[PDB]
Design an enzyme around this catalytic site. Sequence first.
Site, PDB file in Angstrom:
ATOM      1  N   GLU A   1      32.341  66.236  71.715  1.00 46.72           N
ATOM      2  CA  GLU A   1      33.461  67.149  71.928  1.00 46.72           C
ATOM      3  C   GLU A   1      34.736  66.663  71.239  1.00 46.72           C
ATOM      4  O   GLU A   1      35.533  67.472  70.770  1.00 46.72           O
ATOM      5  CB  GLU A   1      33.722  67.350  73.421  1.00 46.72           C
ATOM      6  CG  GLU A   1      32.689  68.216  74.129  1.00 46.72           C
ATOM      7  CD  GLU A   1      31.559  67.403  74.739  1.00 46.72           C
ATOM      8  OE1 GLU A   1      31.537  66.171  74.543  1.00 46.72           O
ATOM      9  OE2 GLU A   1      30.698  67.999  75.421  1.00 46.72           O
TER      10      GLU A   1
ATOM     11  N   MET B   1      45.638  47.242  59.574  1.00 46.52           N
ATOM     12  CA  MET B   1      47.042  47.275  59.981  1.00 46.52           C
ATOM     13  C   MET B   1      47.369  46.249  61.069  1.00 46.52           C
ATOM     14  O   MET B   1      48.396  45.571  61.001  1.00 46.52           O
ATOM     15  CB  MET B   1      47.419  48.676  60.462  1.00 46.52           C
ATOM     16  CG  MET B   1      48.902  48.850  60.721  1.00 46.52           C
ATOM     17  SD  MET B   1      49.878  48.652  59.218  1.00 46.52           S
ATOM     18  CE  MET B   1      49.302  50.054  58.264  1.00 46.52           C
TER      19      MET B   1
ATOM     20  N   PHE C   1      29.576  69.037  91.230  1.00 49.49           N
ATOM     21  CA  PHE C   1      28.828  68.567  90.069  1.00 49.49           C
ATOM     22  C   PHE C   1      29.568  68.869  88.770  1.00 49.49           C
ATOM     23  O   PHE C   1      29.875  70.026  88.474  1.00 49.49           O
ATOM     24  CB  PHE C   1      27.435  69.203  90.050  1.00 49.49           C
ATOM     25  CG  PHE C   1      26.595  68.796  88.873  1.00 49.49           C
ATOM     26  CD1 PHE C   1      26.157  67.489  88.734  1.00 49.49           C
ATOM     27  CD2 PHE C   1      26.232  69.726  87.911  1.00 49.49           C
ATOM     28  CE1 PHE C   1      25.381  67.114  87.653  1.00 49.49           C
ATOM     29  CE2 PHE C   1      25.455  69.356  86.828  1.00 49.49           C
ATOM     30  CZ  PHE C   1      25.029  68.048  86.700  1.00 49.49           C
ATOM     31  N   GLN C   2      29.855  67.814  88.011  1.00 46.54           N
ATOM     32  CA  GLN C   2      30.560  67.917  86.733  1.00 46.54           C
ATOM     33  C   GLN C   2      31.914  68.611  86.863  1.00 46.54           C
ATOM     34  O   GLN C   2      32.247  69.486  86.067  1.00 46.54           O
ATOM     35  CB  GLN C   2      29.702  68.657  85.704  1.00 46.54           C
ATOM     36  CG  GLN C   2      28.405  67.951  85.363  1.00 46.54           C
ATOM     37  CD  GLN C   2      27.715  68.553  84.155  1.00 46.54           C
ATOM     38  OE1 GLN C   2      27.687  69.772  83.980  1.00 46.54           O
ATOM     39  NE2 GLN C   2      27.162  67.696  83.307  1.00 46.54           N
TER      40      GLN C   2
ATOM     41  N   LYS D   1      32.915  79.328  86.221  1.00 47.41           N
ATOM     42  CA  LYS D   1      31.640  79.911  85.812  1.00 47.41           C
ATOM     43  C   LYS D   1      31.362  81.272  86.452  1.00 47.41           C
ATOM     44  O   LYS D   1      30.766  82.147  85.821  1.00 47.41           O
ATOM     45  CB  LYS D   1      30.495  78.948  86.134  1.00 47.41           C
ATOM     46  CG  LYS D   1      29.149  79.382  85.579  1.00 47.41           C
ATOM     47  CD  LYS D   1      28.111  78.284  85.714  1.00 47.41           C
ATOM     48  CE  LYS D   1      26.758  78.742  85.196  1.00 47.41           C
ATOM     49  NZ  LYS D   1      25.722  77.682  85.320  1.00 47.41           N
TER      50      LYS D   1
END
Lengths: 582, 582, 287
Positions: B59, B485, B121-122, B171
Amino acid sequence: TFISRFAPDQPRKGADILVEALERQGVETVFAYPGGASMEIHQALTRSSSIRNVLPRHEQGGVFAAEGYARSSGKPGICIATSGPGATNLVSGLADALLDSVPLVAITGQVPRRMIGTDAFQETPIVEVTRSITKHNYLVMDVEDIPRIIEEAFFLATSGRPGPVLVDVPKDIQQQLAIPNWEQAMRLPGYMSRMPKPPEDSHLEQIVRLISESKKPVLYVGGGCLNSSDELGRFVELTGIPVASTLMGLGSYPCDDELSLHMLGMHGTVYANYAVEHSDLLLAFGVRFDDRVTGKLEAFASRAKIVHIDIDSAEIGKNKTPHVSVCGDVKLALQGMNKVLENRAEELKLDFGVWRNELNVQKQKFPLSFKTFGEAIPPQYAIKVLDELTDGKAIISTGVGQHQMWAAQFYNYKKPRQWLSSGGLGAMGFGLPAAIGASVANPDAIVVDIDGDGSFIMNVQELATIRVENLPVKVLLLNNQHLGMVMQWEDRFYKANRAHTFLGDPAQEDEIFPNMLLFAAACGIPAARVTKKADLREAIQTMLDTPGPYLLDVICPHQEHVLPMIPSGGTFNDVITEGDGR
Amino acid sequence: TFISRFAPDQPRKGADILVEALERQGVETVFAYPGGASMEIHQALTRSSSIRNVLPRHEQGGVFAAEGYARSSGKPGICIATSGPGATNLVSGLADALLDSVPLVAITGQVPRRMIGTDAFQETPIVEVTRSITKHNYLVMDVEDIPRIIEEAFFLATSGRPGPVLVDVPKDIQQQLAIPNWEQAMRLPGYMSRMPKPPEDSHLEQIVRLISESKKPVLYVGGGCLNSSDELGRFVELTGIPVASTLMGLGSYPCDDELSLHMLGMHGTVYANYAVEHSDLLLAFGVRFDDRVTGKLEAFASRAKIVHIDIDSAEIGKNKTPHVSVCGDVKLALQGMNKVLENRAEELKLDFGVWRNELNVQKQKFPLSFKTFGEAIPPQYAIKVLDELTDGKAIISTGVGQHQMWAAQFYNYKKPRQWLSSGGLGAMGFGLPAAIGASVANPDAIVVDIDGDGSFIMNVQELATIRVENLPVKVLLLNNQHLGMVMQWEDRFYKANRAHTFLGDPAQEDEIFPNMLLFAAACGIPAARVTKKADLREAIQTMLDTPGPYLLDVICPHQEHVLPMIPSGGTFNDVITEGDGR
Amino acid sequence: KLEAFASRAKIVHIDIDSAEIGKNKTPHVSVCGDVKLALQGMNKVLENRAEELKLDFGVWRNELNVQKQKFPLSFKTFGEAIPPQYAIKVLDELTDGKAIISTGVGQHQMWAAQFYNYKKPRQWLSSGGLGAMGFGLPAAIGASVANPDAIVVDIDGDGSFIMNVQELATIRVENLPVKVLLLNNQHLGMVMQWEDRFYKANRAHTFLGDPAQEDEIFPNMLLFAAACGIPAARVTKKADLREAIQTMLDTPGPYLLDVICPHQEHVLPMIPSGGTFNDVITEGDGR
Ligand SMILES: Cc1cc2nc3c(=O)[nH]c(=O)nc-3n(C[C@H](O)[C@H](O)[C@H](O)COP(=O)(O)OP(=O)(O)OC[C@H]3O[C@@H](n4cnc5c(N)ncnc54)[C@H](O)[C@@H]3O)c2cc1C
Ligand SMILES: Cc1cc2nc3c(=O)[nH]c(=O)nc-3n(C[C@H](O)[C@H](O)[C@H](O)COP(=O)(O)OP(=O)(O)OC[C@H]3O[C@@H](n4cnc5c(N)ncnc54)[C@H](O)[C@@H]3O)c2cc1C
Ligand SMILES: CCCOc1nn(C(=O)NS(=O)(=O)c2ccccc2C(=O)OC)c(=O)n1C
Ligand SMILES: CCCOc1nn(C(=O)NS(=O)(=O)c2ccccc2C(=O)OC)c(=O)n1C
Ligand SMILES: Cc1ncc(Cn2c(C)c(CCOP(=O)(O)OP(=O)(O)O)sc2=O)c(N)n1
Ligand SMILES: Cc1ncc(Cn2c(C)c(CCOP(=O)(O)OP(=O)(O)O)sc2=O)c(N)n1
Ligand SMILES: Cc1ncc(Cn2c(C)c(CCOP(=O)(O)OP(=O)(O)O)sc2=O)c(N)n1
Ligand SMILES: [K+]
Ligand SMILES: [Mg+2]
Ligand SMILES: [Mg+2]
Ligand SMILES: [Mg+2]
């Protein structure tokens, strides 16, 4: 008696104070990726001869490694990141640790204090961002607060219900010279006053009374029992009550044991869900009644008197209301009940043999099963072979998806903290880094990452970490060229209509893409691919016998569905036992 | 007139309403990784014949691709993620887009409404998490609000000062049948009332007056001028005022032009910083006076009357107080001033030839330079060769570090939106995904990711995306086996004491680790490695001439330091012109 | 002290808020729901199994009756001075315990809760959790509007009463039959009580009168009532108290009775904050 590398009257940088603070907590390993705002801390780490840094290739890999370190040891996992992009890369790990209640201390560098809020170079308000996804967090505003905050951070992360604690340290604080005071008191009066008392005899005797009056008792064991392996085993011996575990509680009670009902829930065994469905007494120890487990709450253990023992009072009565409850350490509660169950053993003729026999019938008629199609490799079988060849003593980290469930179903974990898996958040790309942290915490153990091709590639860069650190991490890659679980839901709820679930190359459909063997070769890690089931046993054996890191690419049919399955928000009568994608 | 795939009186899922809402915004491409909470949306996407999905392998790769898509086109970038771990993986991208003011619309799936707040959940409270790192965000609580919110999200993301907007969609909302209303009004009365008016003649005439009264004027151009290329060029012709750009404003004015002072700031050219230091008039157009640019504010343009034109009123007077300011579109301000400067050209004998000559002396005595050691490849030279072979017309995305600065210094961008780089946040692993988004938005362009070995490996998994999508992405990998760097700062501030900055294998120090060629081969991407400077020109030529993706592994000495350098919080007199790590 | 509270008891907790169940003390048995419905369910069982369950707690009730006999609610009567406890007890008799009582916060609040026997719920209106002064008079207004035919009495203290004294205007304009039983002790009683027990009776801004005229009642609350056209009176002698309250009730419309009380009174009994039952204080005042 602790020995400092500095004189008691010698001024030193805040960064050196911070590192010594970690040393005084017994920290031996950190997972830190260097950046500008945390350079001082990294310089201080090199001066430490007791703290070792494992350099990841991504901060998300770093925090997930700290989780694996924590889950496989019981110690707090420590990760350090720089400001801005470094800190934001920890977020998935912090959320993951909070949902699974994993002890974690995350230290982030920050821009100088005067620079905060000015949209400065590499500045994020990480305390604001992570407030809702950590147990607690801090913004250090003075060098003199470093010893206190670090002590509080470790205390909060490890005590009560464990969780992640983030400490944001401005760069000018790291550079300031000061003489630290280690004899200062923590400022947590509210938290410490709400710390659960040791379980009273009054509540424990009430539970024992319920046990003697029951005829169909079931143990509902979860992540809260991971430190109560011995006590739980003693409890089962005295009662004979069958044990059903959650995804997070695997290993607390031996899965290969006779009284083990294995895992319950959405993808739990039929007989485990049956036991809870028809129980008259449910002993919920160290669980939180998740929706993956219960389904429709009103139907979950509807005929049972519910006993709930949790160290978090906010969990007791949240989803289901218990008839009897204990707010405290389940380890102490088990110890108290064991003494009573032993002294009154002759008085209490506990015998649930009839109930156990009823469950054994269900275990006989509805066991875990899988099909073998020609020479194609069944993922369930591959995991079962790994179990045999490692004698069930291996540490198993997984990704998230179908392979995750099969790794939980077809491997019999004998002890707790062998099973490392993202349960609450279910974060992909967790397997490989978690195996890294586990191997660091357990140098002599067999560490195996059972991963899917989708989850594995997400943090594939950590293969570099594995080789550089010379960690004997084994990767059992179950490759089905798809996002398995989503694909499964497509088959059952969307007429098998594919919506971006294929992970291979459409130009070469039958070619395995990507070539994971070349990912391993890029990092000097020996690898192999097995396709025929006949060659599988020798392949896994080779993976284990070969010293050091290893990647085994196991090719699996993508038509496999995880069974059995209780639909989301469903009941036990809605359980699905047969079907796939063929 | 828009044509829907549904009848005006036909009920349809919220997911189908959401996708059509995107269609009505002219969206042609999204970057979406499927998950449970967003499956409905993904199913709806397949029914769309106008919207294409580019499936990433992470993602973070998805949101960074949306940024590259946005930065290289001026269109809003759209990424879609699932709940929980999917949403949290967007965070670095959201923060990145906010700091660089990049138009971005991020859509995340969420658990059902009734399930929110129950640690489901999630589930992550993504709105709480991302409130401080987005321009605005939403939680859709009814299917009827989808058309309005989506319209508002795109409006807010693209209007005024552009930025990321996140829309969280439960959802059950995606599954609900409804008849959408597209003729509804936006609920943004406060925002729209604070939208800057078109620039008044009063303020524009004040600026022109200052120009005619100045003798040492300097243009201070930034990311706000990316849509004012034509207007800025016309302005320079009429005034003859030399132009200095920020890291974000490269290309707004042609770098190869005679009046171009190139980049100013910490690693800006000596003559650019000199011009600002001795200017008596500073025209700050589309900039925000970042600390990388100004250093010690009291010393920055201390002898200059400051003109600041910004579309964000909160930026005007934040760090430095301007004598003259305009709150509005710099594109419109330039148009207004050009008309005045043309009609009064004979009246205003504008001639800053003496001032320009003074700067040309500084450009002669302190030009951008580098050393060539034997046959070793100078990274500066490699980028300069790429410039010649692509005729400065290529789209360049970079990582973060030394290579980032050299890509900004030694490539002369002729137009805006050729230069894609993380400036405000400075996020590693940005280069490769951003190139993906750029190549999708610009199919016929030459897209090159100038990356470092540390930044490249962070999102190396997106190589799979490149092959699958058949994108002609070229990767110019500057490999110095270190974090350049940070290593540079170690040399100057910590006595070259190495603190976890080596990226190779300590067991094989002289061996290049990892083997990036094998990463490319894993994803079926042709690759090569060049070590000798003599072979470099032919190697880059091969990379460009070879159709499709390509990875060139350029081996560089790690002793190189980025020059010149003004220390953090320093002044122009503190500029460093010589030195490295040898 | 929670650990000492009902330490020998099995605790049953019925609350409609699940967040309250197990917050302070952990119950052995709990029900998350309407207590009204829970009572209905238990009553049906207790009635159908009454003969089976020979419930008799007569021995336990007798044990408590002994404690009720040896330690009842009490107060002293000093000469002709008016005991606030007695004043409230007289109000109870004259209103037959059917009045709606709103109070302020402090000593008078406790005495109004101790010495008035409320027969039904929603007769007692008082700020408990927050304990906000100036609540009594306005609450009586709302109660009188909701219950036009009821006897509404604001038992207030001089400190709490003056805080929202402006609502007297509201009472007259709306013609509400609000009765004000003002227990005037010229001090902030409860704070003064805590001064006596924990700070050696050291006065820290608890006197509400005029130091220039210590023995003069200040302010004159009768004139506050007269300002709003509300009939008022003041009683000082205990002998005249019964007739005064009777007059307040019999007089149609709003009324203010200014009852002068000794400020040396302490609310008893008292269990110290964070203390146990063994720490209970039964005797003592400020004399
Ligand atoms: C793809 C996928 C599928 C899944 N399907 C299933 C499934 O089929 N079955 C299943 O079970 N899970 C499943 N899950 C996992 C599920 O989402 C949860 O992670 C899990 O069910 C919850 O674990 P738990 O109930 O044991 O409580 P935990 O999340 O492990 O938390 C521990 C609980 O015990 C308490 N506690 C902690 N320490 C102590 C102590 N010392 N004493 C007393 N109490 C303590 C804590 O307060 C907490 O309430 C799945 C996850 C994924 C990603
Ligand atoms: C390793 C590293 C080194 C760096 N060193 C340097 C350096 O040496 N020199 C340098 O310059 N940067 C450097 N930076 C980048 C620096 O941190 C900032 O990103 C950059 O300086 C700020 O860009 P900006 O001032 O042009 O404003 P931006 O961040 O580009 O924002 C645009 C500004 O213009 C306004 N604006 C937007 N649209 C309009 C419009 N239509 N009309 C009017 N106004 C508008 C906006 O409100 C905003 O204030 C470095 C970054 C990194 C990672
Ligand atoms: C190309 C130069 C960028 O590299 C670096 N800049 N830098 C710093 O700039 N360090 S710093 O104390 O003075 C600072 C000042 C202002 C705002 C932020 C910071 C900061 O901490 O950023 C990390 C710093 O520490 N590094 C490594
Ligand atoms: C092993 C099973 C896990 O796979 C899935 N579970 N799942 C769902 O469970 N979808 S769901 O509407 O009913 C739901 C219910 C309760 C809490 C969360 C959710 C949710 O949206 O999670 C994504 C869902 O959509 N998928 C793909
Ligand atoms: C970062 C992230 N994205 C998306 C998801 C949602 N998700 C996805 C996309 C799964 C498929 C995992 O694919 P895999 O190949 O790694 O494993 P399986 O094929 O065995 O399912 S599992 C699952 O629930 C997730 N859990 N985490
Ligand atoms: C995700 C992340 N981590 C750390 C940093 C801090 N950081 C780091 C670690 C840099 C080194 C980048 O290494 P590289 O090999 O990709 O490029 P160079 O060698 O040219 O510097 S640059 C820099 O400022 C960052 N910007 N982003
Ligand atoms: C608005 C406010 N201020 C202060 C307090 C604290 N407080 C104070 C100052 C009380 C004394 C009330 O004086 P009173 O004359 O109205 O009543 P008593 O004399 O019967 O105590 S009671 C008490 O707990 C409070 N509850 N509310
Ligand atoms: K990655
Ligand atoms: Mg897969
Ligand atoms: Mg490098
Ligand atoms: Mg008083």
